[PDB]
């Protein structure tokens, strides 16, 4: 197999990383493993520290959400954690100077997710990401320079569950003006688990046994991003939109299906769209849904991405003129859009590189 390296600018330090991403499960998160090498004649009264700080970038500031300190210096604590197979394998090849380090990401932490900067926005990242750095310092309070330390960026990702869930369906009944029969609208999906790029299908059974006629039917898919810094705020993003000029006659039934596909090829100009965490300027796809234990949000202080397709049924308000009169009957169909379970480490860049 192959490993990853991040050489220090001065050439006196390096860190070895087995793999870039880390799958985060419902209750436990895969531990972060690696080995840091420090050149000889450089550790005399010197100590080595490795951090796993995570912060939400602001622009141009940042706010730390999780920081962990582990000391991999030649002075080793009496209580030594067990070494994984990958760490032990790197010890033999690198040498006896190799100093392994380990990390334990706590559960219920935001995943590596970013947002689209925009047309006039700068190159600074707006989303959240995970960082691994290695440096030498006498103590934590001691200042650490830039050329004397490494800067390795990692991401935390989630994969689609292997257990299919119940089929999503919606029910509604909106009464019209004082005297009218009820309006019944049906909406459902074939399944709730959709892979990235896979088509999405929605089925509609609307039966309008009322005087008011039915205008064009609206089909749209909206992405939810509840970014929280000090207050809870949600955002709207119509990733997919469908136009259907079909109409339903009064006291008549209707039944049709529509097919869509969410992608950012036509959504590049949009601002605030949620995308998967990117280590470099290379673009990624739409952000996957964030699975949660559902016990309690507990102010996760991050970004949670949710998807649900919305059907809008606008009425033409038959009877009087009612040129501007229109009532929107809508329901929400939650669904999950996540990557499937893989068998290899993804390349964090476009596979055919334009260079």
């Amino acid at each position, epitope marked *: *197999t*192959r490993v990853f390296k991040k050489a220090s600018p001065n050439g006196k330090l390096t860190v070895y990383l087995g793999k870039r991403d880390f799958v985060d499960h419902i209750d436990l998160v895969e531990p972060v493993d690696g080995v840091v090498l420090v050149d000889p004649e450089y550790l005399k009264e010197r100590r080595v520290y490795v951090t796993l700080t995570a912060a939400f970038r602001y622009g141009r500031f940042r706010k730390d959400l999780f920081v962990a300190n582990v000391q991999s210096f030649p002075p080793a604590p009496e209580d030594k954690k067990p070494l994984t197979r990958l760490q032990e394998r790197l010890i033999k090849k690198l040498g006896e100077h190799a100093y392994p380090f380990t990390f334990e990401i706590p559960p219920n932490l935001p995943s590596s997710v970013t947002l689209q900067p925009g047309p006039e926005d700068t190159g600074k990242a707006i989303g959240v990401d995970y960082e691994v750095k290695a440096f030498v310092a006498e103590n934590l309070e001691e200042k650490i320079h830039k050329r004397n330390s490494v800067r390795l960026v990692i991401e935390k990702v989630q994969y689609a569950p292997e257990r299919p869930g119940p089929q999503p369906t919606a029910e509604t009944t909106r009464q019209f003006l004082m005297s009218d029969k009820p309006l019944h609208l049906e909406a459902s999906l074939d399944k709730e688990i959709y*892979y*990235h*790029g*896979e*088509p999405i299908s929605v089925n509609v059974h609307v039966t309008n046994n009322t005087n008011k006629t039915v205008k064009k039917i609206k089909i749209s898919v909206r992405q939810y991003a509840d970014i929280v810094l000090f207050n809870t705020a949600q955002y709207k993003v119509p990733v997919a939109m469908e136009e259907a000029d079909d109409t339903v006659a009064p006291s008549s039934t209707f039944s049709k299906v529509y097919t869509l*596909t969410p*992608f*950012l*090829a036509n959504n*590049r100009e949009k601002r605030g769209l949620a995308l998967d965490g990117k280590l470099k300027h290379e*673009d990624t*796809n739409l952000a996957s849904s964030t699975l949660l234990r559902e016990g309690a949000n507990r102010e996760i202080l991050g970004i949670i991405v949710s998807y649900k397709v919305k059907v809008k049924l606008v009425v033409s308000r038959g009877g009087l003129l009612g040129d501007l009169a229109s009532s929107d009957v809508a329901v929400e169909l939650p669904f999950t859009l996540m*990557h499937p379970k*893989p*068998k*290899e480490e*993804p*390349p964090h860049r*476009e*596979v*055919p*590189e*334009h*260079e």
Partner: antibody
Amino acid sequence: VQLVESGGGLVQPGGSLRLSCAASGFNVYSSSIHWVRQAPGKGLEWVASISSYYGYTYYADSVKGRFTISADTSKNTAYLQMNSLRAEDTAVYYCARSRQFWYSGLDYWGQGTLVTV
Amino acid sequence: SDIQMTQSPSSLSASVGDRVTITCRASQSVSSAVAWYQQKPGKAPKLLIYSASSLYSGVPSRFSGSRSGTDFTLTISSLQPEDFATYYCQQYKYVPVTFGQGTKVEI
């Protein structure tokens, strides 16, 4: 899944052909479409590629500018408009398929149609 | 500077079941973006392995691949009669995707 492509035949230099590639069992948004040609008796050669999910479009240097590739998601077909042929451009063209996400090589290949100048 | 990938052995002649080894070098270093393909006369190419270490689905286990530095090798444990075909290299690290020269085995 199985895919079939057709739309080739004997032509003259300076002509224009449109190659249709019917696809079944998969869409174009979740799977990139690539065109690979093979000269008679020579090795394989890549000419163009398309990825509708990101909108990226690439062409080989020898066919840059001449060839335009487009994918129509309505009928789920891959289309390649090729113009201004010379003698050295004759070969057999294969409409292959690759996974847009988690690229793992050209897993699926077309039947292949011969193009003669 | 387009990447040129060449295979030293033009053709291999071997009996049935004997071990056969091949090599396939690259002008520029490629991490793992190497895929192996085989084709028969009057037939479409078929993928054998991807990433030079992984094994595709539906392929016999006798096909094995490995990498060491800049070269890539395809090894066949037992040479079944149906395996007599032509093999090709491929790299997909950059957009100028280039294939190998082409190697053919026969008996």
